[PDB]
Amino acid sequence: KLSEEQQHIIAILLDAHHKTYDPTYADFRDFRPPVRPLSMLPHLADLVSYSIQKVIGFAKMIPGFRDLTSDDQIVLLKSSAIEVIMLRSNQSFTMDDMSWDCGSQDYKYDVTDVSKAGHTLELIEPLIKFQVGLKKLNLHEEEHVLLMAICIVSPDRPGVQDAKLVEAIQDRLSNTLQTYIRCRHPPPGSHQLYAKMIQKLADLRSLNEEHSKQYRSLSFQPENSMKLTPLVLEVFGN
């Protein structure tokens, strides 16, 4: 069953998430104002930038993450950043209208807002489909934080050095998730739940890939790169 360590792992992750995800979305007011020719870029650039900071705050609390070297921690964050932001955004996504509801109407985002950031349906369509399938899973918050932590500590991320150590940390998280599903997730919602969760990690790899492509495209234009932030440039590329 759920050993003491595993129960500890869940509590730590839950708290780490609670300390990095503000469901009141109060900070969105500090971002450059959203405008509804890439009129949403300044706003979403700031939102993404803000989100990267929050994802880092979460990662540092992942039991074992700090044991990794500086370079491996950096490699994991740069490669998973966009994936965890997509994954954590599911919390504000609504299947009512396929949009992300972050408090007010000014901070309620849809397919048009993302396109107005310079992205095409080649990314947006599968992004919504992802959000929909993840939502359909109705994960317990415990499963949600474990999935984000597992996504961050992935051994196959390019540039990783101590893959062995990275894999050990992730396996400890995986076994925690698997065991939690058996012991705390009642059927039928638990039916192949683990496998479906891992499929979403594969889905994220594909989304990451497409995002990077469109990002390289968008940021290649100095006028667009100019509207981004220093953190976004450092993490996503320059």
Partner: peptide, 10 residues
């Protein structure tokens, strides 16, 4: 180098 990421990591 990643100064900002590094700074946020420590």
């Amino acid at each position: 180098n990643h100064p900002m990421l590094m700074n946020l990591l420590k």
